[PDB]
Amino acid sequence: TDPRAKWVPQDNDIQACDYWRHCSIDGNICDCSGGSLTNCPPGTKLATASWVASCYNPTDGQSYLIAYRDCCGYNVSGRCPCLNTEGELPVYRPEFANDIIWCFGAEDDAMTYHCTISPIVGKAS
Amino acid sequence: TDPRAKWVPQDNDIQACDYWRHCSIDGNICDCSGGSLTNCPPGTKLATASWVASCYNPTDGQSYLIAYRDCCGYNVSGRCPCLNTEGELPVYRPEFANDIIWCFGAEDDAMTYHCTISPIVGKAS
Amino acid sequence: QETQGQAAARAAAADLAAGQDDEPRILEAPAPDARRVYVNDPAHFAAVTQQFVIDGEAGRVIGMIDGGFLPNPVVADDGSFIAHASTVFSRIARGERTDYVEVFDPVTLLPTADIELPDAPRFLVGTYPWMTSLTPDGKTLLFYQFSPAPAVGVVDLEGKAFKRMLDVPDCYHIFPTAPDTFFMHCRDGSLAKVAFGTEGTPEITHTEVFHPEDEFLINHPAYSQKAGRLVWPTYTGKIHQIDLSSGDAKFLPAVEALTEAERADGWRPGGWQQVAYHRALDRIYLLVDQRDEWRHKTASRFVVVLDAKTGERLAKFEMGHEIDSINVSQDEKPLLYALSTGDKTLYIHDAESGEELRSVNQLGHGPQVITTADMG
Amino acid sequence: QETQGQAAARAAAADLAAGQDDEPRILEAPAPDARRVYVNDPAHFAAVTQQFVIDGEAGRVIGMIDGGFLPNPVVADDGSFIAHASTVFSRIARGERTDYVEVFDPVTLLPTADIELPDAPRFLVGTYPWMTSLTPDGKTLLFYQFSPAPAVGVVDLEGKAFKRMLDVPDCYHIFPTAPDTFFMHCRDGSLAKVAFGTEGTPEITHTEVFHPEDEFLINHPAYSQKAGRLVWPTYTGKIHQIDLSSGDAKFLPAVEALTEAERADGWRPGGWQQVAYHRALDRIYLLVDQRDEWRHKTASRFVVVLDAKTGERLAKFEMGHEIDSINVSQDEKPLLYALSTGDKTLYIHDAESGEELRSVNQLGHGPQVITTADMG
Amino acid sequence: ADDALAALGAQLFVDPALSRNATQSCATCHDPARAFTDPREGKAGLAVSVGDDGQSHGDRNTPTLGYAALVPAFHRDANGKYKGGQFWDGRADDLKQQAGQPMLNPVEMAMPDRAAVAARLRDDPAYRTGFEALFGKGVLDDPERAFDAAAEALAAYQATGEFSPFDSKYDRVMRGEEKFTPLEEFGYTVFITWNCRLCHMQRKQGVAERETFTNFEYHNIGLPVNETAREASGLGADHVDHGLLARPGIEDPAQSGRFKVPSLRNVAVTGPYMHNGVFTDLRTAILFYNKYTSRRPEAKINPETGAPWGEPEVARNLSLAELQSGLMLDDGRVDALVAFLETLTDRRYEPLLEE
Amino acid sequence: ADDALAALGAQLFVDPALSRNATQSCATCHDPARAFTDPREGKAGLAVSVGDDGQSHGDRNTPTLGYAALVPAFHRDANGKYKGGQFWDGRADDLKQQAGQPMLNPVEMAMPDRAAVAARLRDDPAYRTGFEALFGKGVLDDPERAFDAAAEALAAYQATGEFSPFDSKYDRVMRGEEKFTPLEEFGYTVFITWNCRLCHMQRKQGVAERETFTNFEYHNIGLPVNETAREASGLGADHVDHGLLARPGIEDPAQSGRFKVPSLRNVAVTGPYMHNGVFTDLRTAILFYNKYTSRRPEAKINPETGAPWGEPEVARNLSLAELQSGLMLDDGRVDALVAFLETLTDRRYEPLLE
Ligand code: HEC
Ligand code: HEC
Ligand code: HEC
Ligand code: HEC
Ligand SMILES: [Ca+2]
Ligand SMILES: [Ca+2]
Ligand code: NA
Numbered sequence A, B: 001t002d003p004r005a006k007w008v009p010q011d012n013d014i015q016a017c018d019y020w021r022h023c024s025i026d027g028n029i030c031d032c033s034g035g036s037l038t039n040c041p042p043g044t045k046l047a048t049a050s051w052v053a054s055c056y057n058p059t060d061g062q063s064y065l066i067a068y069r070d071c072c073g074y075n076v077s078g079r080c081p082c083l084n085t086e087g088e089l090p091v092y093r094p095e096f097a098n099d100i101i102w103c104f105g106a107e108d109d110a111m112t113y114h115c116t117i118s119p120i121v122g123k124a125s
Numbered sequence C, D: 001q002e003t004q005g006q007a008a009a010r011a012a013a014a015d016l017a018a019g020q021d022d023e024p025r026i027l028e029a030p031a032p033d034a035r036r037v038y039v040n041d042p043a044h045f046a047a048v049t050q051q052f053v054i055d056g057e058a059g060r061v062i063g064m065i066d067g068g069f070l071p072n073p074v075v076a077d078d079g080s081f082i083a084h085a086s087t088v089f090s091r092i093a094r095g096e097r098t099d100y101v102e103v104f105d106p107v108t109l110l111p112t113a114d115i116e117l118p119d120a121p122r123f124l125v126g127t128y129p130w131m132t133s134l135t136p137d138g139k140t141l142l143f144y145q146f147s148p149a150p151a152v153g154v155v156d157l158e159g160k161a162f163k164r165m166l167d168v169p170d171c172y173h174i175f176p177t178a179p180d181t182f183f184m185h186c187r188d189g190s191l192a193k194v195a196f197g198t199e200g201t202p203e204i205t206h207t208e209v210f211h212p213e214d215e216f217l218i219n220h221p222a223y224s225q226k227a228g229r230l231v232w233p234t235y236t237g238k239i240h241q242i243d244l245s246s247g248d249a250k251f252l253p254a255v256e257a258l259t260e261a262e263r264a265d266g267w268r269p270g271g272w273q274q275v276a277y278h279r280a281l282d283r284i285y286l287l288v289d290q291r292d293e294w295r296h297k298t299a300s301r302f303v304v305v306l307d308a309k310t311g312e313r314l315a316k317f318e319m320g321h322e323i324d325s326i327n328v329s330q331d332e333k334p335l336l337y338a339l340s341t342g343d344k345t346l347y348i349h350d351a352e353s354g355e356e357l358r359s360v361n362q363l364g365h366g367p368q369v370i371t372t373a374d375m376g
Numbered sequence E: 001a002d003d004a005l006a007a008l009g010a011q012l013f014v015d016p017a018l019s020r021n022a023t024q025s026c027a028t029c030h031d032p033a034r035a036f037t038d039p040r041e042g043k044a045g046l047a048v049s050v051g052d053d054g055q056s057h058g059d060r061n062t063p064t065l066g067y068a069a070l071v072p073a074f075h076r077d078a079n080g081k082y083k084g085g086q087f088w089d090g091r092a093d094d095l096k097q098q099a100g101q102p103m104l105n106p107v108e109m110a111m112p113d114r115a116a117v118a119a120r121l122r123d124d125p126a127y128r129t130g131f132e133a134l135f136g137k138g139v140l141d142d143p144e145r146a147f148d149a150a151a152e153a154l155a156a157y158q159a160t161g162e163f164s165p166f167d168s169k170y171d172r173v174m175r176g177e178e179k180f181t182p183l184e185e186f187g188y189t190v191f192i193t194w195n196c197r198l199c200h201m202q203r204k205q206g207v208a209e210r211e212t213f214t215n216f217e218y219h220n221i222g223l224p225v226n227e228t229a230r231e232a233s234g235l236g237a238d239h240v241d242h243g244l245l246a247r248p249g250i251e252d253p254a255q256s257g258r259f260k261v262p263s264l265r266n267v268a269v270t271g272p273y274m275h276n277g278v279f280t281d282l283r284t285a286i287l288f289y290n291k292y293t294s295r296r297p298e299a300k301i302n303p304e305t306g307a308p309w310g311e312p313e314v315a316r317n318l319s320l321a322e323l324q325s326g327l328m329l330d331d332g333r334v335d336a337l338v339a340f341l342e343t344l345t346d347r348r349y350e351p352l353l354e355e
Numbered sequence F: 001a002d003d004a005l006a007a008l009g010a011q012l013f014v015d016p017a018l019s020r021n022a023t024q025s026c027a028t029c030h031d032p033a034r035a036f037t038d039p040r041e042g043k044a045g046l047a048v049s050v051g052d053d054g055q056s057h058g059d060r061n062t063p064t065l066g067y068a069a070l071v072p073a074f075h076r077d078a079n080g081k082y083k084g085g086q087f088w089d090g091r092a093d094d095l096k097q098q099a100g101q102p103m104l105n106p107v108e109m110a111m112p113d114r115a116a117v118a119a120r121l122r123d124d125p126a127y128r129t130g131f132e133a134l135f136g137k138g139v140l141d142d143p144e145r146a147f148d149a150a151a152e153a154l155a156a157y158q159a160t161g162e163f164s165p166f167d168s169k170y171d172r173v174m175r176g177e178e179k180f181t182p183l184e185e186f187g188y189t190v191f192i193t194w195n196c197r198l199c200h201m202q203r204k205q206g207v208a209e210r211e212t213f214t215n216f217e218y219h220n221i222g223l224p225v226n227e228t229a230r231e232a233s234g235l236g237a238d239h240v241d242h243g244l245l246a247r248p249g250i251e252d253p254a255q256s257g258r259f260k261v262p263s264l265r266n267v268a269v270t271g272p273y274m275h276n277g278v279f280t281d282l283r284t285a286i287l288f289y290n291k292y293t294s295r296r297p298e299a300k301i302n303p304e305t306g307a308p309w310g311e312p313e314v315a316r317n318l319s320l321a322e323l324q325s326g327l328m329l330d331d332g333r334v335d336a337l338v339a340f341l342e343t344l345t346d347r348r349y350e351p352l353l354e
């Protein structure tokens, strides 16, 4: 609850903002509006653009690359809102920036933000 | 603070939901978004249509007809929300019904709800 | 005791440890069932709004649907589609108005029809379910127009086109009984039966007057289309029941949801969707609380359950929250849905014991309207 | 001690008593002055949004402006007009996208221009003030495009027309210095000068790199167009100052907003609009707090104030609330504005003493951006 | 002196000696038995009035004098709105400036000049006594003084409680002495929630002490020419009644076709309606407003004729903002409004309400 | 037998006795010194390879054998997408089914039939010893058994660690043994966040144990004809390479013009690029992708020619959803990607990088 304190990851609840994969998420957890950890809700469109962070998993002690992808074409879900910024860099380093609506490549040119998914796409380094 | 208690009118603060003229208001007090008690905020459109209520004035002991008028063409203000229903009748008695968006006659065919004004149009009978 | 977020965290960890792959994709909502529940959020007159599709058994959001200014949701009882009549503007809340109907596939939630309504004919009002209504065959959508005069718009869902406007007398609400017939409630205290065609003045016949001018019938009656039962409370919790199953109005004996003592002590119905009806059980559910007579739109903390035939009270539930709207699932061992506009939360109760089972929070800005399908 | 609502009740009561008549009408906002303050609500990525026009001296909302998806506000320094670049879709958040610029009269708040931007060229992002920018003359609006590549759009406000897109290098933000010239900040760590004419490729010049790769410059620098002062803080509170007044970039001595001891104690800037610059006083204001290095977007409870020329701390204010954004009025005896996203409230402070004078609450869902005109 | 001035006016009011052929007094056209309006059938029915010569018709309907004393003197308000005065076009500043005009108008009382009026007053010993007692000796010897004094006397008479008794059912209801029927109460609620209140109530907001159901403003509601009246008046097929623009001094072309909002008091018994007496029935006057709002084919049709209402005599400066309300009056609300306006009948004219 | 079998295949791989005129072996075209690709210049440069007859050229680029043993057997997955196999068009099920084809191909090794292959194998006393010990006595007297056995040995040889050592800088960096340079790390970041990873990563999500930077899928990326290569192939101007549709049993029209996603391992040393070797430079291959995203006029131009890329050879079934990403790669990002792909070079070919 102390907003300024060093963020502490857990691996026990994906709908909470301290879940380890959400280390640089911005928006809403898709699992809270009909998606899942790594899937979009019905009626939305999955973007191909992504932003990246290395998120430490407290369970196995390993650091993974989480490629955050947006689900687009819907108004913001308003469920499970989170903002974390582990390793997050300013806009001029866009690959690591998370104020950007990463809806690029979404079907039907969908560009409105609904929610973000948190898939692992590799090991850090 | 008791939502179910008999509504208690006052004549000392127009931004409060218990202000006497707000006895059958539904929506937002216009004074709180750049209007006044009887005027619309800049950019909005004044409806000519109205809903009426007899509201008791605790200053003078008179009951006045308040012809509520909507200010229209803007998204809801979100400031000073209130809902009171003194004398409010169901929709089939529309001159007393307050769920209706009473934006009819507004300039530019404006029909969205922004806020409501509370002008006196006569004495109650 | 394990939450959905915990179960998913467990599953995700197992997948990662097992090296299990899966393709990020667009999920389908689970097949429509009896325990699906829709919650609409008119968002206190915001220019845009949201519908929440919920699995009531799990208490999980399974989907959402966007809408514009005060849309009217409908749900096909057979679970084959959902639809709404909705309103948008070219510059958020200003500029050119477009009224339209969308039909949605119930599992993909993709629009399968977008039917424009000419001359912006929708009634803009705090959301009343029976201001827009499907015919029993689900082929026609009927919407109310208030301005310039009471009228009913006919939309052909099958052919995906607007048909016509119907001139009606000074009457309100639309309770369909047949592919070509609906009833309305009139200012004069009668019901109006409207039998319509593709062209020509519809056959309009009034029932006899069934209530005095000083009994006030709430804007949210419960109507069971499959039963032909209109359950209409007054401000005092007196309940009018009209049997429409024959094609014509049959007035049932009035029942009192509250005892004489309770009424003497200030018990009145109150909220938004104050009344529910379970078809198979023939039961009436009513939101009631101790209140002043002109606080008829405030939340209530109690539901009374009563037999429709006898008027005998079967239960009085202490809800434990500020409840504005109720509805029930239409299956055996039904759920009692209890929506709190203030809490932005759907509370899910066992309708037999009244016990709170689970809850679904964060449901928009001011959710008010609960809809279920009667698939029984 | 008398509130505005109370004072308004007395005036209304006295009008009624005296039999004073008054026509219900549309009010004009009072003339733009140094103490008018705009608060934008990106509403946590909602498809529609609101701007609040506030009299900072009275602590009163004097008007509103609706916007679509993540609009960029701009306010003309001379008070002659306001404008935003905005984004709407044909079905709330789905369908055909329309990007557009609106110019508004600042007393009637009426749109005086509605200029469509072809091919949906807006950069959709958490609102940064300098992603959309007016030229000092106010006749040209410049907006940033990120997709498919960094580019800058030229909008003629005088002729009410989109002109063209400018190809630029891998650079970000738009700081205009002349009717035909603006600066950007590039990935390589240089500033780019971009000189554009009636037609053709722009003349693009780069400065020398002024910061290393491991030094991160925030998304919300303060820029005084009238001073040509670009004040850019890093994650550690190191402050870059670039003088653009001669039309070319000259780098001022770098300054530290925090001492070495504070930095070792974990003192770091954090928030949204973390920095403000007062032109007349040549003074820098920065949102700071004790925090982990990757909690750079959280609210701060402290503001430090320092001399731009020397870097001596002039004050440290304990703000008393969770503050996300700051800005100042550009007049003498300035107000310090402190907007809390969480509280949806603008706290209005005396900039000399840091004392809270008044507050304006209920400002949308997630207000983040404070704008004021430099009229002096 | 206050009682006496009015008493002199009372005498002049019923005195036909103020017309050329002495057939005509104020009371001929402003008949106290018909709420000070003209019951006589002419070439255009009761739409317009026949003057002293037995032949000349006016081009405008004879309005009631009841409650006219409540209208302010003609002026322009800060909002740029003209208000007050007398006549449908407000060409007279007040009651006093008005009174002399019918006396000299050749289509009405037809006295050749002020001297001719003074000569008639001089012939009557009662006037010599009454005038001189109020205005000084030799008053009737000076044509200007005598004409002015006569106007003043008549103005003072129209300001007595006789003309404005405030004893209608509406008035008794507002005093708490009795109640409206459900229909009348519904009529009143409609009147004050629909567009009517924007023009037919004294004030924009608050409560009027002496409500007379007009804001004294000028509006073009888009009425057609009354053809048989326009024919009877002889003004010509190319003649256009410009309303307020016809007042000397008003040059603003935006004022063309605007007329003074009449007080609705006694409306139920002062048919036919509007400035040219175009509508026989009160229901029809109400139905006229539906042309701006209703989409039904019947809304375009004058029920008294079966033909379209007609092209506006002045098809510019229409008060469309007020008239285009978006809401249609159904028959039930027209019924209610009729019943409400009937409560605006003064007590003495209640017996007329039957016919 | 696993070691002995691979040893036998190692013998066969460099033996020109398996070509009609004994002028070439597998190693002639799949040169161990050039990451198992062809260094020889022909009528169309390095784009296509010359066969045993000294005149015939193929219509397709000779791909690396490095890491091909990690490709799954050809199949259609539950998503309806074809995966795996060997050859740019996936016409061979696996490495075994693949090996015998270059032997009997008239434009390659050009042996008349399986009987001709067995006869040459029988001429070698060390093949009689090696084969008979693994497959039994008289295996070489049977044309079908010998040919199948030679295919098995060659496939087994290709499956040894020598063809798939996983000792690239990328591999060392993922083992925490060293770090990327800034440019290299930027390139990796761009690779995994841009559209590249939708096709050039084994998995959709999670971590692959033996990453080869290909999902084994089949995609039409809308490449033009390689004019000189097609000319050299002798197949004719009328000819259209339909990729996977060419595979016997593939009838689905949606498969026309699609090819197997190549592994990007050793890509920096295995130019020219694509199925027809149309692009000589690695940077060009990367820049080709900008043609679908960039609005800049330079993106329409092949920098190797100064002329428009050319119309696709097959103008349908383009992977537009994947390719039209909405983001253009600037020169800085192209540089980074080049730097990253260079880290997929096996240790022994790092000297080739210069
Ligand atoms: C020939 C019938 C006739 C006679 C006689 C007559 N009038 Fe009139 N009166 C009218 C007509 C017609 C109008 C409206 C004319 C117009 O608006 O131009 C009118 C208008 C008025 C008005 C203005 C009322 C309003 O609401 O605008 C007053 C006051 C008035 N008359 C009083 C008198 C007095 C006093 C006399 C006697 C000196 C008199 N009239 C003689 C027919 C007559
Ligand atoms: C735009 C202002 C305006 C509005 C709104 C308006 N009126 Fe009028 N009304 C007038 C004017 C002006 C006249 C005189 C028209 C004329 O003759 O030129 C008039 C005339 C009348 C008359 C005839 C009275 C007479 O003595 O001839 C009746 C009855 C009437 N109005 C009733 C109504 C009712 C009922 C409504 C509500 C449906 C209404 N009006 C709405 C301005 C208005
Ligand atoms: C004349 C030069 C040449 C010779 C000799 C040759 N190949 Fe090839 N190889 C090619 C060409 C060209 C292709 C691509 C053909 C195609 O895709 O249609 C290829 C494709 C392959 C592939 C598929 C790899 C992939 O990723 O699709 C394998 C495995 C292979 N060869 C192994 C061998 C073996 C083992 C031999 C010895 C029996 C051999 N080759 C002989 C030129 C040659
Ligand atoms: C649509 C899936 C897809 C996407 C997205 C994609 N590729 Fe490819 N790539 C392919 C296919 C298929 C081929 C082989 C094309 C052919 O020869 O027909 C290929 C060929 C290549 C080659 C030539 C390798 C060789 O041996 O010939 C390189 C290098 C390459 N891609 C790199 C990239 C980079 C870098 C990106 C990101 C900018 C990328 N690709 C995006 C599928 C894809
Ligand atoms: Ca009349
Ligand atoms: Ca190659
Ligand atoms: Na006539």
Ligand code: NA
Pocket (backbone or CB within 6 Å): F044, F047, F226, F227, F228, F229, F278
């Ligand atoms: Na070539």
